[PDB]
Amino acid sequence: LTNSYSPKKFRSRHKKLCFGPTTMPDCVVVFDAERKSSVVLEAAKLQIPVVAIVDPNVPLEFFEKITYPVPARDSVKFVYLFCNVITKCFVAEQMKMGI
Amino acid sequence: TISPAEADRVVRDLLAEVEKEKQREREERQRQGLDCKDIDDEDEDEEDYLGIEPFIEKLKKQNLKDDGELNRREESSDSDSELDEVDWDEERKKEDMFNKKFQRHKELLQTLTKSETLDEAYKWMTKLDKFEEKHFKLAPEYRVIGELMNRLKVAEGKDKFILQQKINRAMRLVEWKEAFDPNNPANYGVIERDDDMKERDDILLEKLNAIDKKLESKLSELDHTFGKKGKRLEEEIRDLAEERNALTEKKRQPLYRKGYDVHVIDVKKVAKVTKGGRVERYTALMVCGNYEGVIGYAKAKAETGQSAMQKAYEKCFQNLHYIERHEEHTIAHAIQTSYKKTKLYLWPAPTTTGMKAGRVVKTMLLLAGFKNIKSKVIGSRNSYNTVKAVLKALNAVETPKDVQEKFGRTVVEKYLL
Amino acid sequence: MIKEIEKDNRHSRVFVDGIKQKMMEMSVLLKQVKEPGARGSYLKDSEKTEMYRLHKENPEVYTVERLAKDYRIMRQRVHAILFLKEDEEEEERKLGRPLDDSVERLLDEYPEFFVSHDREFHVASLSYKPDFKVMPEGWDGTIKDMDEVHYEISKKEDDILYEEFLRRFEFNKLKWKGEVKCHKYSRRRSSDGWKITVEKLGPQGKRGNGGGWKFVSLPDGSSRPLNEVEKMYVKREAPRRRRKIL
Amino acid sequence: LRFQTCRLLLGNVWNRELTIIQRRILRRLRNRKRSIKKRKIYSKKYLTSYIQLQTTRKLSLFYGDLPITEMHRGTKRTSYIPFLLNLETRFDVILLRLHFLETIPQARQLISHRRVCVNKGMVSITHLKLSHGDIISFQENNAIIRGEEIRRSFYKEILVEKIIGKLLHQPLRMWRRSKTEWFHLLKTKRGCRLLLKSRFLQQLRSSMQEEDLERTKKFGSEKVCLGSSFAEHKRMKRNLLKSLFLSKRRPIVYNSSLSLYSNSTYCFASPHKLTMKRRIKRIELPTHYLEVNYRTPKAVVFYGPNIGHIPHDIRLKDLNLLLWSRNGRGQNI
Amino acid sequence: SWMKGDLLSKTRRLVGGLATREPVWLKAMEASPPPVFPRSNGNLKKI
Amino acid sequence: SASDADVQDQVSVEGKAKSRAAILDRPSSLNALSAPMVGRLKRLYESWEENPAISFVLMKGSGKTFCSGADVLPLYHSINEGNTEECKHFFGSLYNFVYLQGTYLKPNIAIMDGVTMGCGGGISIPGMFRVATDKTVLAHPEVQIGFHPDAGASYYLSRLPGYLGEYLALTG
Ligand SMILES: [Mg+2]
């Protein structure tokens, strides 16, 4: 995200080639509990709101950059429930403009 | 303009007019008696009402002394306007932008007069209203000053005083907003090249989306394709990747902002030791500000002293802070803060004091827009730490509005009590 | 219907044709508001001469305050105008021929050829020194307007400036007439001696806040209260309880 | 002596007539100034030394060769505002402001050589501070020469500076030819009054009036009219749309209302137009604190000066490095 | 940067002073602000 | 002044970031309004409306009672001592306060954490937002005392669905 315009090169089968987003996102929804990626740090660096589900053992450094914390244990039922509320809310908003 | 022949015509006509007025007045007085020793030898030769005759004798002899080109353009005497050094390209672009918008408004009017269905007329007037909301929209700040100026022409006494002060504050705020609106693309630049901007970005966006779809389609088939067909798909994918890299490089156009001032704080020569000698590079630290509360800084490293300043000039507009001032000339209260070993003290001052500061702090406060501040730097005087400590102090200041929000009380100036 | 839409065409025309005069008057209002109290107009010599004859023919009603309110200038300026007009008419009375007005008519006919900055009313210069006070939590009451307080300050300073100008200008006017010595070689002894101005110093001889009471005690052994010239001297030599304005 | 300072300050600080060689030199100097003003982004010593020293030198040359820095460091204040306000009440400064003379050295010559009176007190103090109430006059033996000088100076500042720039942008040699014919009109009182009563100067009055109308639009002047008359500009489109519905459900009026709407929305929304032709430096009358009767001539002081009404040719951005003033409120701050 | 406050307040203070252009998410954040909960003294009671 | 210290304690003011909350603090008479309380609340609400730096206002009661009504015993003694001007000035002040609440230009929020009788609902229920707790009790026992549901209670009771307003006002 901080370097989303850097060039890419085709090599092989690899892990498949993918460029960055052409448009800067307005919100980032994170499902990372093991903290494998730097997405929270990059979004904090680039001033983007973050919706993420926080563990009881989250570090302060990662916590303070999260705009919308949802305190829970991310079980399969709660992940489904979260995504269901998000999808239903978004499509209900989309229908109000005739789309 | 006026032709030289026309300018000669008027002065010859005026001399003939004063001669004919003398002749007609002399005759009018002569016809009633009234000998004209006050018209003759008093209005023709020995009047000398200004003392112009020495200048006449000087200029008449000077006008023939040398020769050359009688039509040659020469430099202006009362020259040095000193503000007329304006890039004329934006001036000659905005005029035809407005001309095109006005012509489009006229065509919408001439379509609305030529419509035939009232449903179609409703559609056309909606189109006209959507046009006039985007190209001919008056900002809501102007109607407040409109009502106030309506009251001002009929108010008198104390009310004229109050209305004049309020409209003066409104004039300042509207002028500032118009000159530094970030939404208006006319407040941006091209920085040396290292409504057309929106469509220029849009066509690149559409080309990028098409290239992404084609790349996805070929990458979908590479897994099942084996052999020379796979090799030619690999070459086509590589060519598409080269094209998309070339398109995404073009979206990196740095922009500066008009009206901002950029100054150099530090240029240093740093060196790294290798087995072949010393590797010497350059770092430059630069600051920028718009005199209205927005201030920023950047640091960059290149190989040459010009390229370091160019890189920091490019990156100077990406880390911008807003600083609150008290009555647009001084800070709200005294503030002391430290960054590492650089301790910085700032004190406010009354309105006719001036700014008492060193080079780095004075440049930073001048670009931020302060006018009456005293300061002192105690400890280490590293320039980069001084820049950082000034930005810490200017952001640690609690405004009266901040005290009001923090405590839920009313904060009143003491002379308004 | 056709009359109703004809009247609207006349009503739109009466704005479209007179769009420019609105811009003229609004430009004058902008010049008035960018520097507050500036009148944007350049009072002319014809208006000064009308002011002089209008004050001369009716002094008891068409006074200096009335002239200043009608012509929207400062009372100091009105006093200077009247004094200079009396001097001008005395000069023309001594000459017997009217004076040269070539400069004045040039400034009169073409006010757009020069720059003028005359002032209508005085606006005070404040120091915006930051100093606050936090109200109690259970407080009710309307805080004053900063424009109102600036108005009060400007009014007070204009009163002080007006009376200071009067005290200086009357003394200068009778110095112009010639009742004041203002030379080392024009202060000569009388036939009886010198007069003195005895002042009763001390806290018991105080005429008020500012100095002590005064009397004369003439060289012959008699003493009298002060005259108007001596009273002006007493008024103009007193200390003043303010910082120096302008 | 003095023209060498134009090479120092890269401008026209010399207020005397220029030869062709001096004009050619001044072209190169103005090119050098234009090149210097571009490279300010790469300079460290710009604000604290260069511009401060240039503005100090300009003030020293403006006030007639005086040690501005020394007389300011004598006082202990940082900002230049009270020093300059106090300097503006000096005697020879006032004599320059009233346009009774031409130069600060000429005023110093007249004051030192015992020829100017204050309240009929003949004074010889050049640095004398005048408060409000002082009366400035001359001697009766010199009054006719000073009146002649004032008349000549004003009727030649209407000519050698005013008519040369306004619609008469002729070359220098053509203007030096035509200037004798323009001089010979001014030899008589009749030739002055006829010059004043002319359609030439009336056209030049109207053109300056329209130019000064146009210059106001930089401050959003034309939008103040929209904010003033927003009701009728809505009623115009309201009438056009009501007509376009009523008289179409059941075209000269259409074309008239379209022309009216187009004229109004053109005059209310045309942007500010800027020309290459520069505005001309006019001569300022100090009517905020001095009152003049030009016949005798006589003056009376009646107020204090203003910091923003000093007739200097320095940019506000450069001068605010010395004044440190909160400009915009109209006060002496 | 060196500004103080959280994302919404810092962004609001920045866009009020004409430093940055208005981001799209600012209006959605103003319409739906993040939650707040009172102070807790750091003590968890064993149920 | 030094004379108002009882009424300052009777009507406490809480300040927040952009809001002001008036808290009724009469535990002896269970938050029953008086003419000083209504006048102070009128001044506070007028100033908070006049201020642009306040975004919304609030009304709370302290204890187990929001507001039990108005002070009728003081009016009874004032009638018994002969005069009627105290009662007249009390009624006009209370109805003016209700009218100001009904035409208030900012959001007003009324919290109801207890009993509410008489004008205690008339000062709040024309508000823009009304929050009710589980302990909230709203009743109108004016017919048992011989008075009418004054202070705008003839408005929101009349605009209830059905004949429910008649039922509640008559039966208490
Ligand atoms: Mg050290």
Author numbering:
A (entry chain A): 107 to 205
B (entry chain D): 70 to 263, 295 to 517
C (entry chain e): 139 to 384
D (entry chain C): 17 to 266, 280 to 362
E (entry chain U): 2 to 48
F (entry chain f): 33 to 204
Wording from the paper:
Mitoribosomes are specific ribosomes found in mitochondria, which have been shown to be remarkably diverse across eukaryotic lineages. In plants, they possess unique features, including additional rRNA domains stabilized by plant-specific proteins. We used cryo-electron microscopy to provide a high-resolution structural characterization of the cauliflower mitoribosome, in translating and maturation states.
To trap ribosomes in translation states, we collected a dataset for mitoribosomes purified from mitochondria and ribosomes treated with chloramphenicol, a classical inhibitor of bacterial-type ribosomes. During data processing, we identified a subclass corresponding to mitoribosomes in a P-site tRNA-accommodated state, which we resolved to approximately 3 Å resolution. This allowed us to build a detailed model that includes the tRNA, the messenger RNA path, the binding site of chloramphenicol, and the peptide route through the peptide channel. At the PTC, within the LSU, we fully resolved the binding site of chloramphenicol, responsible for stalling the ribosome in the P-site tRNA-accommodated state. At this site, the first four amino acids of the nascent peptide chain were clearly visible. Since mitoribosomes were treated with chloramphenicol, we were able to resolve the antibiotic’s binding site, revealing that its mode of action is nearly identical to its binding in classical bacterial ribosomes. In the decoding center of the small subunit (SSU), we also captured the mRNA being translated, from which we resolved six nucleotides, three of which were interacting with the anticodon loop of the stalled tRNA. The ribosomal protein uS13m probes the base of the tRNA anticodon region with its C-terminal extension, behaving in a manner identical to bacterial ribosomes, while uS9m, which has a slightly extended C-terminus compared to its bacterial counterpart, probes a different region of the tRNA anticodon. An additional helix in mS86 is stabilized up to residue 54 (compared to 28 amino acids in the empty ribosome) at the mRNA exit channel.
